[PDB]
Design a protein around this ligand. Structure first.
Ligand SMILES: Cc1ncc(-c2ccccc2C(=O)Nc2cnn(C)c2)cn1
Ligand SMILES: [Cl-]
Lengths: 156, 39
């Protein structure tokens, strides 16, 4: 089925009606999402099947049809844009200056924008439109609000 | 069976709604890929 670059919804019919469980990025013939969206299952595009190629539950990432392609990195300074794709709603750019997740293994960009869980996998962009990571894995804070890592894979 | 549907091009958009704060947070990442607040 459809192999054009861009952002895609990930849907299921296993619940009431058609339910958006998350979002992904198609780049260079590879579909990129978060592991918690698909749990590593195969996907349909039209009549075509997308098989998992690479994944890691700890990174919470998965690639379909080929290896992880997205290698751009937050500069640690500039604003970025969440291309939010919320359930039933149009793709919308939201621009923000990321905070920082401080961990024992290093600092990671973080985005403090509140969307339903079905938005998991929406791409985060730099100023040149490069995907610097995916939205949807992070933490609930004092306020009850959600703060997502900028989760990026490695390209070999 | 999960299926995908195209939702857009991946583009920077000038005069996108500029919102959100920039919190600095001490976090831990467990073997299950769940972040937690370290306090
Ligand atoms: C109570 C609550 N927790 C989180 C979320 C949420 C909000 C925005 C994006 C993503 C998620 C989300 O669910 N992320 C996530 C990662 N791993 N798993 C299992 C689930 C909304 N509500
Ligand atoms: Cl730390």
């Amino acid at each position: 089925g459809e192999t054009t670059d861009g952002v895609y919804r990930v849907m299921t019919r296993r619940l009431l009606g058609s339910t958006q469980v998350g979002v992904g990025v198609m780049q260079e013939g590879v579909f990129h999402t978060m592991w918690h969206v698909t749990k590593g299952a195969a996907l349909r595009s039209g009549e075509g099947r997308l098989d998992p190629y690479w994944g890691d539950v700890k990174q919470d990432l998965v690639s379909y049809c080929g290896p992880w392609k997205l290698d751009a990195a937050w500069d640690g300074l500039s604003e970025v844009q969440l291309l939010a794709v919320p359930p039933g709603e149009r793709a919308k750019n939201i621009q923000t200056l990321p905070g920082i997740f401080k961990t024992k293994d290093g600092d990671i960009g973080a985005v403090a924008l509140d969307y339903p869980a079905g938005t998991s996998g929406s791409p985060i962009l730099d100023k040149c439109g490069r995907v610097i990571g995916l939205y949807g894995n992070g933490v609930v804070i004092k306020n009850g609000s959600y703060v997502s890592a900028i989760t990026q894979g490695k390209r070999e | 069976d999960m299926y995908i549907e195209r939702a857009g091009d991946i583009t920077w958009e000038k005069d996108a709604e500029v919102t959100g704060n920039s919190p600095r947070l001490d976090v831990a990442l467990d073997e299950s890929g769940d972040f937690s607040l370290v306090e």
